[PDB]
Amino acid sequence: AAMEQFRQIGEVLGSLNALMVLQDDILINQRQCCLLLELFSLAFNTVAEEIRQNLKLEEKHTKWRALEQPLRELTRVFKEGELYVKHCMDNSDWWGKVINLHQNKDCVEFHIHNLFCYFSAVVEAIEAAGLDPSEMERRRVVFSRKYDREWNDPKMFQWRFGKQYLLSRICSRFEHSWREDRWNLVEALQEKRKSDSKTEKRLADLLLKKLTFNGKLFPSSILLGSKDDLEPLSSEISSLLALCHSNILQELMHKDLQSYMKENRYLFSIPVVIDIMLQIARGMEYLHGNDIFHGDLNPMNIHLKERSHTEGYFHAKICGFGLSSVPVIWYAPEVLAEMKLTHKADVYSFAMVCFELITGKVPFEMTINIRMGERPLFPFPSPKTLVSLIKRCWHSEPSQRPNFSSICRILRYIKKFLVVNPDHTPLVDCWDLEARFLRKFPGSHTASVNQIPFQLTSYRVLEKEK
Amino acid sequence: AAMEQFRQIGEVLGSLNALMVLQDDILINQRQCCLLLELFSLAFNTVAEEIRQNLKLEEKHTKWRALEQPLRELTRVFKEGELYVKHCMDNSDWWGKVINLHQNKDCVEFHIHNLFCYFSAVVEAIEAAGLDPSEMERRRVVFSRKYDREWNDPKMFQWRFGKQYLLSRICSRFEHSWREDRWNLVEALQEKRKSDSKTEKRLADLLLKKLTFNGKLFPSSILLGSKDDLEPLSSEISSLLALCHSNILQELMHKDLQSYMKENRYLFSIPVVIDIMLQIARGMEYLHGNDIFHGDLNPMNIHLKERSHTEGYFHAKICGFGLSSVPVIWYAPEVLAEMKLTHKADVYSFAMVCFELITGKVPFEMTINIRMGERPLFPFPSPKTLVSLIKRCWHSEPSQRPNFSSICRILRYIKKFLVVNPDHTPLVDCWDLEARFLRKFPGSHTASVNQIPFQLTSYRVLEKEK
Amino acid sequence: AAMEQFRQIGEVLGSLNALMVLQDDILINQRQCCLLLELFSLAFNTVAEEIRQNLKLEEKHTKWRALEQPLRELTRVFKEGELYVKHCMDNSDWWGKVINLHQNKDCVEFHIHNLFCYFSAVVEAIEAAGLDPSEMERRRVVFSRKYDREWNDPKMFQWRFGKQYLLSRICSRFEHSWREDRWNLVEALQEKRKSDSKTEKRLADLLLKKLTFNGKLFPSSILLGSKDDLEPLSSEISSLLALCHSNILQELMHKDLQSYMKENRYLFSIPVVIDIMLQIARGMEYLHGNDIFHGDLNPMNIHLKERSHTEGYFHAKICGFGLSSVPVIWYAPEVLAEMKLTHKADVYSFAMVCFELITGKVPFEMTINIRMGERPLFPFPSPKTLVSLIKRCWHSEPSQRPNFSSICRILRYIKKFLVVNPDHTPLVDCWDLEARFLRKFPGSHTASVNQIPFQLTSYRVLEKEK
Amino acid sequence: AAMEQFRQIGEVLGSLNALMVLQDDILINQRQCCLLLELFSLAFNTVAEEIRQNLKLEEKHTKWRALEQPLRELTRVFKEGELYVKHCMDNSDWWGKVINLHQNKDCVEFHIHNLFCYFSAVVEAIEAAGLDPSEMERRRVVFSRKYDREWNDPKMFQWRFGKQYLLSRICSRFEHSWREDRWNLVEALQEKRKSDSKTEKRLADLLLKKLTFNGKLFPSSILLGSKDDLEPLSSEISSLLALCHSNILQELMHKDLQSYMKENRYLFSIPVVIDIMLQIARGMEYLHGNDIFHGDLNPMNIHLKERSHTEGYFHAKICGFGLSSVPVIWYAPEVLAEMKLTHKADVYSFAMVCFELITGKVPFEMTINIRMGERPLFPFPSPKTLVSLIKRCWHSEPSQRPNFSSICRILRYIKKFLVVNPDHTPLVDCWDLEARFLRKFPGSHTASVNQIPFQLTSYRVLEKEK
């Protein structure tokens, strides 16, 4: 039930607030998770406010039916966030907790990332207008002018709708949180190491130095080894230690993708297939945030996991990109020419990975044909939206295949469209719309979460213009 | 789990707040239920604050175990309150909703009554002290002085602990709420009747007049009669219309007690038996709040119900007290002398009713013996606390049996003691303690909910003195 | 200084809040003045917010210069409100305080009335745009579309700008405040009269009955008479007791107008002249709110006063309208025909009164000429805006002269225009603009303060269309 | 007037809040001054709350007279704080503003230091009890038990009164503020230097490095010299750069003391004399916070200033302590033995300085006599409290003269006593009381502002025991 789903948001947010009110016991977050609490409270309050202002609270079972899917996805993301706060509140091996936790976590930004990617289902809250016969027209034209061509700009948007889509002037707050946690952590570490009163202190010093290169000093971590790096060269390749993102195994992957594939008979919905694609992308171009190139990408290198209380949703990272010291059908066509670590080239692998996910079948029932450009074809059952995006990347020229920034946002747009329509036409081929946003407005090596409300809207605006 | 129970409070309160944020659609409350939301938020916030201040958030599974039962009862009462808010938010027969709802409801005060009767399980939050060895003594003596003999006074208490036990200077707020609802209601009724545009309006006028005697004008209520008052005399007996309390069927009783008895083999725990007793008392002396005397009380006149999401708890009212126009073993011994509507006499019936509830067996396997004073005796299995209270009332002299005020509060004290100790000695015979509070401090025709924090504490103070 | 004026708002509001935090001692308001505190805090917070959002806090002395006059008038009204709260907080003759105070006060609504009439100098806060050269155009066109022809509607406005111009859904809150004060008052009166323990109680009963006709029972008010009603007939003429407004002497007028005139050599600025006119109008048509007609209006019947900390501003009421039991140059031309208590006729007197105020000279250096329609002419020094309004009313036909509703709002529009422009062309003759608002939208026996934001805006919108 | 003084607090706090609501324009504070706003709002709210709870708002002119002096001093400190926020909000030479401002400012902690030193005039708010005759005794004994001997402990106090004397668990908040300002500053500096687009950037790099030793690189600061360090040795003596306190000229002293003396005929009240003493002490032992010893102290080295809107109050620093590369009557008696940079020795100079301040006359109308121990004697007019403290320090043994920690707090106790009693016996010689606090509880190289509520109370407790 629609309104009932809202009460679920209330329940989850109350749970979060109850857990958080006993705050000062945390020694890692309480400056990250506090941001989560504030953002979630703001989101709930603003969706409640806009409901109260633009709906009428009598037709609880007749003319709210459109609200179901978006609010359900919202309870999912809220639940996901609360569970992260829980795992950060656990009392389990404080030292191992420090290690596993944020030196390089950013799970808070990942969660708010999903929150943003789905909050733009405020477009639902706008379906209340669709009592008074003349009024309906007023609301329609109001929203129409809210979607006018002259409204496409970071400044103009961020000023005319900042408070409707959660953007304050606390856009820069996220980074301050990412910082004060660090200093509380090092203060606690110094307190521990100098107020020690075996070998725990030694780690602290090694650990404290990292937050102050490549320490990697001692086997002091005796490393009691369960089931399952050769020379002191390429030391500078240890920067890896400064590539933090919740889509990159900085610690351990539960299982990989190719493993999860061969016994997969469909387990991936268009609504987890698209997601499984995005967590890669959202995480991919952060590599280019330091210009590092994965080079070889394969389902043997994408470590998925389980999303807890979700309908099969998984959080995936990417492993093996680092470590450049030591079948080819997963290589790029241009990297067939060895007879190739272009930023552009990696898309062929990304596309190739998605090729499996959609179909669930590995490419081919030949290498020379790949250079020519002939490519395997997906089945009739596969949907129109997914197929168009992969094929465009599929083209042989390396420049004509789109970068990750040019491919992440368009995926998340598909997400918003799906969440808006539980049933099943897609608007248009997605690629054409992106070019517009890419075409003029563009001119961005890395993108942060603040841009999501704008990017999501621009397509809504751009799409109307056609 | 203790802390887990708290998260349940968070969930319930979030549910309530989500339902309430869509407020203005209500046409009966939104000045009563708003009081509920404010009080519940204050209760949650203050228990959270005192937890954060007097506990330490690491021993989540070791030294909080004492918190379980009180917080569980708290989630019960919170749940009960949310469900009332729901029933008031329902969209079902707005006119019948107006009738059934508050002209004489007071369900808000009944709910806050239970909330007060159980919040004094803040004494649990004081068990955190029972890390630092010297500190434990400090907290013990602090609480000891919090329980000093020189602290027994409405003013001194209400000033030195008002904010710890929820009492503001919004003690008088409750009545203002009970009022503004009325005026919003009559304003909506006038709007409806004068903006009518069959016979709905006629009711309004009759209904509006009541809130402006005995209208009872017409059979305009055609009264489509399901399964199942003789002359125009004793018109003044219609005051009944001004006796409002959520423990008195002002509209219909689902089932009575004697009905629920004969097939009852125990269904009543000491923790619902005591409660079933109290809802009577809490509701009994409100009759004396207008000096009306029930006279004849029998399980054939106590209409119990179901408490929804509770462990068999029921909300009961009293029916047949009014209507004075038209076996004796349920009569008082002094009203054996007919060969008798004393306020004192009714206790014999109340006691007699409780006599069944404890034992579950009707008195006797004789009337002359009752005048003499011989009385039936309860079995060995029955607990010590319940037996002492009934027997004292049982005594033949009508003056030596205690009034309802003198018997309600002592029952609720047993409630607090039980909630504090899930296992199973009782402190002392309860009657001795009441006499002390009754003995000097007393000097009270009616009592309101504000007095509950004080009354509950006084026994804790009085009991220590012994 | 512009920003400095804002700090003055801060100072005044802090003063108000400090006085109000010691609230419960008040026995008349604390439900009226509390509304004042809430409204003023909201006004300050929202002007601060919109400043922070649409200005840049560096050009504190260069590009804020336009903000001076509106914010200065704002500190005036805030100061006026605080002083009212003071007079209500005074400890002076609690009984006389009750009498003089709200049985029929409405000073709270009068204050918020001025607050609304001047807050629409938010148009100033919009002058910040007038750093980035392209941006200025964006803000200009944004505001332009904020002033589009398709935006003229109570619903559409009250929904699309309610929070920018203070209108909540607490528009109806004002009346609830006007009510709960009454009931706190009667509760205190009952407490006093029944807990009396000479003749003070007798008044209470007489006073309590009025709030429960024409009591006017006894000379119990011995009436110790200072310097300075004949028979028991026309009893029904005592309704006067139900005509409450802060522009009508319900208790005593310090001085009248004609008195203040002959020695007045200009004391009335266009900015107090217009105001002196409005307080009449705002107060005039409330008479028609019960259809009562003043009939004869003269500067010998307008009791002005002093506005405390203001630049000569005065609060005026109207006396002698009631009492219908027992030179003509102040009579209407049609009431020359006696050889006449039309609602329309009174305008001639109102206009005639304004005729003095502008010029400061009584009409004429003749009665037959007045019937013909010849009228005295104001001097060249008098401004264009004031002259156009009086002359239109001046016309002989009684129907073609505008009603008070049709003349109050247009005056207050002149107020907003003046406050917006300290220097000195007027936009257009004011009368033409009103006809538009009057022409279709109209279809209003009485108007309340909630309509002011809309009415003020409509002219801004209507004026652009021309 | 007492209550009127409160309204002044309201005015000042409103001024502060109005200035602060336009926050993000600040590029130095907005993490320091924000702490000021929060603390001041908390202080105002809590004094208002305790007034409302323990006073009665009718005797506004009779039984509040005791509140005058403490609340007046409070408006002073609030005003002082607002003016600091102003100077930090000024738009004057952003670069010079950065230099002069907090690299080593701590003015926020200095202001809150005065706020704490005077808030313990909450003891006034306790004078309301001194209507009901029996009640007065209740309040007296309540406060008595609030001052029981068993209550002397950091934990017990900080837990049983933390919220009454402003101490949260935001005691550690102060340091976080002192930090985030730094990082916002370096972020803005990096933004400026890398987005430069003459020689301003060079400074930034030098400046940025300091916040990352002794740079002191270039005369790039051309140093346009007004009216009015020899070799590259003792480089390590540049630590001075890490000795930050608002009582130590880190930049320029307006005037010194000896200058201000010879024409001073009294200008120093016991209420600015004591203060002038304290700002030294509060600032003195921070030198021992890095063990540095001033060695030679003279009115030729104490640079006083003007306290703006205060009654002659001045903020003084200490200059010349650093720079150890290159009449004796101001030297310590033991440093007469040269025929001496003890931490103990400096007191003789401090005492000697105070000796002037009290009397206003330099010591003597002889050196050999000083070794013997004969000392100049102050006049009969000088008060008893000041004389006892200086004389004890005056004793010849260097160990028997008290350290700064042992002498700062006792001075501030005199402050509280004076503020509590505008008229004029002192309680006892102050020195005896300190020994008690010093005697057991002590066991503190440096003390921070958090300790002030406790230290101030302990004397109140200790003094009662006698």
Side-chain angles (χ1 to χ4, degrees), chain A residues 169 175-176 179-180 183-184 187, chain D residues 24 169 175-176 179-180 183-184 187:
Chain A
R169 291 201 163 205
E175 207 278 336
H176 298 321
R179 282 181 103 184
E180 185 175 2
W183 291 304
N184 288 337
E187 285 189 1
Chain D
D24 47 6
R169 291 201 162 205
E175 207 278 336
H176 298 322
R179 282 181 103 184
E180 185 175 2
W183 291 304
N184 288 337
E187 285 189 1

PDB file of all heavy atoms in Angstrom, chain A residues 169 175-176 179-180 183-184 187, chain D residues 24 169 175-176 179-180 183-184 187:
ATOM      1  N   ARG A 169      24.014  24.654   0.909  1.00  0.00           N
ATOM      2  CA  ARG A 169      25.292  25.280   0.605  1.00  0.00           C
ATOM      3  C   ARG A 169      26.353  24.841   1.603  1.00  0.00           C
ATOM      4  O   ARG A 169      26.670  23.658   1.704  1.00  0.00           O
ATOM      5  CB  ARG A 169      25.165  26.803   0.604  1.00  0.00           C
ATOM      6  CG  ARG A 169      24.352  27.360  -0.549  1.00  0.00           C
ATOM      7  CD  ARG A 169      24.679  28.826  -0.795  1.00  0.00           C
ATOM      8  NE  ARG A 169      24.239  29.271  -2.115  1.00  0.00           N
ATOM      9  CZ  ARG A 169      24.781  30.285  -2.778  1.00  0.00           C
ATOM     10  NH1 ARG A 169      25.789  30.966  -2.247  1.00  0.00           N
ATOM     11  NH2 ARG A 169      24.320  30.620  -3.975  1.00  0.00           N
ATOM     12  N   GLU A 175      32.606  16.592   2.649  1.00  0.00           N
ATOM     13  CA  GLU A 175      34.052  16.464   2.732  1.00  0.00           C
ATOM     14  C   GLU A 175      34.551  16.753   4.137  1.00  0.00           C
ATOM     15  O   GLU A 175      35.482  16.098   4.618  1.00  0.00           O
ATOM     16  CB  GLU A 175      34.707  17.396   1.718  1.00  0.00           C
ATOM     17  CG  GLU A 175      36.060  16.929   1.237  1.00  0.00           C
ATOM     18  CD  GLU A 175      37.169  17.291   2.196  1.00  0.00           C
ATOM     19  OE1 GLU A 175      36.993  18.258   2.968  1.00  0.00           O
ATOM     20  OE2 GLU A 175      38.216  16.613   2.177  1.00  0.00           O
ATOM     21  N   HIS A 176      33.949  17.734   4.811  1.00  0.00           N
ATOM     22  CA  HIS A 176      34.343  18.016   6.188  1.00  0.00           C
ATOM     23  C   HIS A 176      34.121  16.800   7.075  1.00  0.00           C
ATOM     24  O   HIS A 176      34.961  16.477   7.923  1.00  0.00           O
ATOM     25  CB  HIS A 176      33.570  19.219   6.718  1.00  0.00           C
ATOM     26  CG  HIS A 176      33.832  20.479   5.960  1.00  0.00           C
ATOM     27  ND1 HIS A 176      35.083  20.811   5.486  1.00  0.00           N
ATOM     28  CD2 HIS A 176      33.009  21.487   5.590  1.00  0.00           C
ATOM     29  CE1 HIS A 176      35.018  21.972   4.857  1.00  0.00           C
ATOM     30  NE2 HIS A 176      33.770  22.403   4.906  1.00  0.00           N
ATOM     31  N   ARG A 179      36.634  14.214   6.873  1.00  0.00           N
ATOM     32  CA  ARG A 179      37.882  14.654   7.471  1.00  0.00           C
ATOM     33  C   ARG A 179      37.900  14.551   8.987  1.00  0.00           C
ATOM     34  O   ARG A 179      38.865  14.029   9.548  1.00  0.00           O
ATOM     35  CB  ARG A 179      38.166  16.096   7.061  1.00  0.00           C
ATOM     36  CG  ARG A 179      38.704  16.259   5.662  1.00  0.00           C
ATOM     37  CD  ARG A 179      38.972  17.720   5.371  1.00  0.00           C
ATOM     38  NE  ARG A 179      40.391  18.047   5.440  1.00  0.00           N
ATOM     39  CZ  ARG A 179      40.878  19.275   5.302  1.00  0.00           C
ATOM     40  NH1 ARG A 179      40.058  20.293   5.090  1.00  0.00           N
ATOM     41  NH2 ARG A 179      42.185  19.485   5.376  1.00  0.00           N
ATOM     42  N   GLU A 180      36.859  15.027   9.670  1.00  0.00           N
ATOM     43  CA  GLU A 180      36.921  15.093  11.128  1.00  0.00           C
ATOM     44  C   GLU A 180      36.958  13.700  11.741  1.00  0.00           C
ATOM     45  O   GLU A 180      37.580  13.491  12.790  1.00  0.00           O
ATOM     46  CB  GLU A 180      35.741  15.891  11.675  1.00  0.00           C
ATOM     47  CG  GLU A 180      35.802  16.096  13.176  1.00  0.00           C
ATOM     48  CD  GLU A 180      34.696  16.992  13.685  1.00  0.00           C
ATOM     49  OE1 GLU A 180      33.857  17.424  12.868  1.00  0.00           O
ATOM     50  OE2 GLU A 180      34.673  17.277  14.898  1.00  0.00           O
ATOM     51  N   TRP A 183      40.522  12.739  12.094  1.00  0.00           N
ATOM     52  CA  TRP A 183      41.282  13.336  13.180  1.00  0.00           C
ATOM     53  C   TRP A 183      40.844  12.799  14.532  1.00  0.00           C
ATOM     54  O   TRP A 183      41.682  12.596  15.413  1.00  0.00           O
ATOM     55  CB  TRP A 183      41.174  14.853  13.115  1.00  0.00           C
ATOM     56  CG  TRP A 183      41.902  15.375  11.930  1.00  0.00           C
ATOM     57  CD1 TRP A 183      43.213  15.161  11.616  1.00  0.00           C
ATOM     58  CD2 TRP A 183      41.359  16.163  10.868  1.00  0.00           C
ATOM     59  NE1 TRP A 183      43.524  15.784  10.433  1.00  0.00           N
ATOM     60  CE2 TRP A 183      42.401  16.406   9.953  1.00  0.00           C
ATOM     61  CE3 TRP A 183      40.097  16.697  10.608  1.00  0.00           C
ATOM     62  CZ2 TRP A 183      42.217  17.157   8.798  1.00  0.00           C
ATOM     63  CZ3 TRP A 183      39.917  17.444   9.469  1.00  0.00           C
ATOM     64  CH2 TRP A 183      40.969  17.665   8.574  1.00  0.00           C
ATOM     65  N   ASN A 184      39.549  12.544  14.715  1.00  0.00           N
ATOM     66  CA  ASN A 184      39.126  11.830  15.913  1.00  0.00           C
ATOM     67  C   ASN A 184      39.810  10.472  15.994  1.00  0.00           C
ATOM     68  O   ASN A 184      40.239  10.040  17.072  1.00  0.00           O
ATOM     69  CB  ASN A 184      37.606  11.669  15.947  1.00  0.00           C
ATOM     70  CG  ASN A 184      36.888  12.974  16.227  1.00  0.00           C
ATOM     71  OD1 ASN A 184      37.460  13.900  16.801  1.00  0.00           O
ATOM     72  ND2 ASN A 184      35.624  13.054  15.823  1.00  0.00           N
ATOM     73  N   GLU A 187      43.477  10.916  16.918  1.00  0.00           N
ATOM     74  CA  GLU A 187      43.568  11.326  18.313  1.00  0.00           C
ATOM     75  C   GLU A 187      43.371  10.133  19.237  1.00  0.00           C
ATOM     76  O   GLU A 187      44.115   9.955  20.208  1.00  0.00           O
ATOM     77  CB  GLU A 187      42.548  12.426  18.604  1.00  0.00           C
ATOM     78  CG  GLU A 187      42.943  13.787  18.048  1.00  0.00           C
ATOM     79  CD  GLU A 187      42.039  14.907  18.523  1.00  0.00           C
ATOM     80  OE1 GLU A 187      41.106  14.629  19.302  1.00  0.00           O
ATOM     81  OE2 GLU A 187      42.263  16.068  18.120  1.00  0.00           O
TER      82      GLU A 187
ATOM     83  N   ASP D  24      28.322  32.245   5.835  1.00  0.00           N
ATOM     84  CA  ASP D  24      29.300  31.585   4.975  1.00  0.00           C
ATOM     85  C   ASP D  24      30.292  32.545   4.329  1.00  0.00           C
ATOM     86  O   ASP D  24      31.239  32.087   3.682  1.00  0.00           O
ATOM     87  CB  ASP D  24      28.582  30.782   3.893  1.00  0.00           C
ATOM     88  CG  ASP D  24      27.484  31.572   3.216  1.00  0.00           C
ATOM     89  OD1 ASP D  24      27.351  32.780   3.513  1.00  0.00           O
ATOM     90  OD2 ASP D  24      26.752  30.990   2.391  1.00  0.00           O
ATOM     91  N   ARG D 169      29.062  17.165  27.058  1.00  0.00           N
ATOM     92  CA  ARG D 169      30.080  16.155  26.816  1.00  0.00           C
ATOM     93  C   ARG D 169      30.667  16.311  25.420  1.00  0.00           C
ATOM     94  O   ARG D 169      31.253  17.341  25.098  1.00  0.00           O
ATOM     95  CB  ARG D 169      29.505  14.749  26.992  1.00  0.00           C
ATOM     96  CG  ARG D 169      29.158  14.394  28.426  1.00  0.00           C
ATOM     97  CD  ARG D 169      29.090  12.885  28.616  1.00  0.00           C
ATOM     98  NE  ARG D 169      29.168  12.508  30.024  1.00  0.00           N
ATOM     99  CZ  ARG D 169      29.605  11.331  30.458  1.00  0.00           C
ATOM    100  NH1 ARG D 169      30.008  10.411  29.592  1.00  0.00           N
ATOM    101  NH2 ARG D 169      29.642  11.074  31.758  1.00  0.00           N
ATOM    102  N   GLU D 175      38.011  22.264  21.078  1.00  0.00           N
ATOM    103  CA  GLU D 175      39.232  21.943  20.356  1.00  0.00           C
ATOM    104  C   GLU D 175      38.941  21.612  18.902  1.00  0.00           C
ATOM    105  O   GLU D 175      39.714  21.978  18.010  1.00  0.00           O
ATOM    106  CB  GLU D 175      39.944  20.785  21.046  1.00  0.00           C
ATOM    107  CG  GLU D 175      41.441  20.774  20.843  1.00  0.00           C
ATOM    108  CD  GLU D 175      41.838  20.153  19.524  1.00  0.00           C
ATOM    109  OE1 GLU D 175      41.050  19.347  18.988  1.00  0.00           O
ATOM    110  OE2 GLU D 175      42.938  20.471  19.028  1.00  0.00           O
ATOM    111  N   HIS D 176      37.833  20.915  18.643  1.00  0.00           N
ATOM    112  CA  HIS D 176      37.468  20.623  17.260  1.00  0.00           C
ATOM    113  C   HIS D 176      37.263  21.906  16.469  1.00  0.00           C
ATOM    114  O   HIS D 176      37.695  22.011  15.315  1.00  0.00           O
ATOM    115  CB  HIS D 176      36.212  19.760  17.222  1.00  0.00           C
ATOM    116  CG  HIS D 176      36.380  18.429  17.882  1.00  0.00           C
ATOM    117  ND1 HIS D 176      37.542  17.693  17.781  1.00  0.00           N
ATOM    118  CD2 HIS D 176      35.541  17.704  18.656  1.00  0.00           C
ATOM    119  CE1 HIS D 176      37.406  16.569  18.463  1.00  0.00           C
ATOM    120  NE2 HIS D 176      36.202  16.552  19.004  1.00  0.00           N
ATOM    121  N   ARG D 179      40.266  23.564  15.338  1.00  0.00           N
ATOM    122  CA  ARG D 179      40.917  22.802  14.288  1.00  0.00           C
ATOM    123  C   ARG D 179      40.292  22.999  12.916  1.00  0.00           C
ATOM    124  O   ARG D 179      41.017  23.233  11.947  1.00  0.00           O
ATOM    125  CB  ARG D 179      40.893  21.317  14.641  1.00  0.00           C
ATOM    126  CG  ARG D 179      41.915  20.899  15.667  1.00  0.00           C
ATOM    127  CD  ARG D 179      41.818  19.409  15.925  1.00  0.00           C
ATOM    128  NE  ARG D 179      42.882  18.663  15.262  1.00  0.00           N
ATOM    129  CZ  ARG D 179      42.976  17.340  15.268  1.00  0.00           C
ATOM    130  NH1 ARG D 179      42.064  16.614  15.899  1.00  0.00           N
ATOM    131  NH2 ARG D 179      43.978  16.739  14.641  1.00  0.00           N
ATOM    132  N   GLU D 180      38.966  22.918  12.802  1.00  0.00           N
ATOM    133  CA  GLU D 180      38.353  22.939  11.478  1.00  0.00           C
ATOM    134  C   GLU D 180      38.542  24.290  10.802  1.00  0.00           C
ATOM    135  O   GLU D 180      38.666  24.369   9.575  1.00  0.00           O
ATOM    136  CB  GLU D 180      36.872  22.586  11.571  1.00  0.00           C
ATOM    137  CG  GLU D 180      36.195  22.478  10.218  1.00  0.00           C
ATOM    138  CD  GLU D 180      34.762  22.007  10.322  1.00  0.00           C
ATOM    139  OE1 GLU D 180      34.285  21.800  11.456  1.00  0.00           O
ATOM    140  OE2 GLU D 180      34.118  21.829   9.270  1.00  0.00           O
ATOM    141  N   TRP D 183      41.683  24.121   8.839  1.00  0.00           N
ATOM    142  CA  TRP D 183      41.657  23.394   7.580  1.00  0.00           C
ATOM    143  C   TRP D 183      40.856  24.134   6.523  1.00  0.00           C
ATOM    144  O   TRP D 183      41.234  24.128   5.348  1.00  0.00           O
ATOM    145  CB  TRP D 183      41.128  21.985   7.804  1.00  0.00           C
ATOM    146  CG  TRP D 183      42.105  21.182   8.584  1.00  0.00           C
ATOM    147  CD1 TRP D 183      43.414  20.956   8.269  1.00  0.00           C
ATOM    148  CD2 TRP D 183      41.874  20.528   9.835  1.00  0.00           C
ATOM    149  NE1 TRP D 183      44.008  20.186   9.239  1.00  0.00           N
ATOM    150  CE2 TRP D 183      43.083  19.911  10.212  1.00  0.00           C
ATOM    151  CE3 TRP D 183      40.762  20.396  10.666  1.00  0.00           C
ATOM    152  CZ2 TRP D 183      43.208  19.176  11.384  1.00  0.00           C
ATOM    153  CZ3 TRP D 183      40.886  19.664  11.823  1.00  0.00           C
ATOM    154  CH2 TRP D 183      42.099  19.064  12.176  1.00  0.00           C
ATOM    155  N   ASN D 184      39.763  24.790   6.910  1.00  0.00           N
ATOM    156  CA  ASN D 184      39.097  25.682   5.969  1.00  0.00           C
ATOM    157  C   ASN D 184      40.056  26.762   5.489  1.00  0.00           C
ATOM    158  O   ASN D 184      40.073  27.113   4.302  1.00  0.00           O
ATOM    159  CB  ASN D 184      37.851  26.309   6.597  1.00  0.00           C
ATOM    160  CG  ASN D 184      36.720  25.314   6.765  1.00  0.00           C
ATOM    161  OD1 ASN D 184      36.663  24.298   6.073  1.00  0.00           O
ATOM    162  ND2 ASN D 184      35.811  25.602   7.691  1.00  0.00           N
ATOM    163  N   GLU D 187      42.597  25.269   3.079  1.00  0.00           N
ATOM    164  CA  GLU D 187      41.930  24.949   1.825  1.00  0.00           C
ATOM    165  C   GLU D 187      41.723  26.206   0.992  1.00  0.00           C
ATOM    166  O   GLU D 187      41.975  26.211  -0.218  1.00  0.00           O
ATOM    167  CB  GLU D 187      40.603  24.243   2.101  1.00  0.00           C
ATOM    168  CG  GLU D 187      40.764  22.791   2.531  1.00  0.00           C
ATOM    169  CD  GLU D 187      39.446  22.043   2.593  1.00  0.00           C
ATOM    170  OE1 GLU D 187      38.401  22.651   2.286  1.00  0.00           O
ATOM    171  OE2 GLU D 187      39.455  20.844   2.947  1.00  0.00           O
TER     172      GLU D 187
END
